[PDB]
Each structure stands twice: as C-alpha cells, then as structure tokens.
Amino acid sequence: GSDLGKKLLEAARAGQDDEVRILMANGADVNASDADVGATPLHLAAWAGHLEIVEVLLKTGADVNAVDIWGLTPLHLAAAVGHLEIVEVLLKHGADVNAQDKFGKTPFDLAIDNGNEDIAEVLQKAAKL
C-alpha cells in the first residue's frame, strides 16, 4: 500500500502489466514522476515497448506529453527505440510531434538517428497535420 508511485514506475519499466493494473486499482498515481529525473510510467512503458501498459496508462489519464529532465516525452522514447505501434497509439492520443528535447531534437530526429525510417515517415506526415 506504500510508495505506489515508485512501484508503478518499476512495474511499467519491467513489463508487469498485471501489477500495473493492481497498483492502479489500489490508487497509484498514473502521473507519478521519478524524484531524480521526472520520468513517468508512460515514459518507461513507451521506451521499454509495453503496448498494453501504454494503453492502460493512457486510459487512466497519463499525460501523453509529460517531459523528463532531458526534455524527453514518451513519443521521443518510442521513436528512438523504434516501437511503431506504440508511436501510432501515442499519436492517436495527442502526442506532440513537434516536442523538442533539451538539445532541440524532435521524435523524428531520434527516429532518423536510430535508423527507424518507417517511424520517421509516420512522424513527418503527422507534422504536416
């Protein structure tokens, strides 16, 4: 019952989707943020490639455009690692294709730099609106 936000961060990173659902049923803050770097459960689930967890967090009110101490959003992270279906779900839920990290880099820039050309094309088309 204690420290549910830290527990939710860990469960999201680790892919523990049943535990995510349990923690949220017991009141865990979907917008919990790491005390040192500001990352949220959605950041971790997007980076780590856990689509079900991404969808659970969005449905319970996670801020799709939350930023961490490096200016990274969940969309940056999914675009860098190269999770196309997560990119698509984040965009459908209002992810900001124009968001810049602390170095000026968009999710598109990270997709380009990581050889994720299919995602980069999705992001370029979304930036035209």
Next chain:
Amino acid sequence: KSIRIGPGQAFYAXP
C-alpha cells in the same frame, strides 16, 4: 545500449 538517446540513457538503458 544501442539506442541513441543522449544523456538520458543513464536512466532508460535498457538497450
């Protein structure tokens, strides 16, 4: 570790 993400790798990596 292969993912090019910048200084934030210290928290996220992972790959």
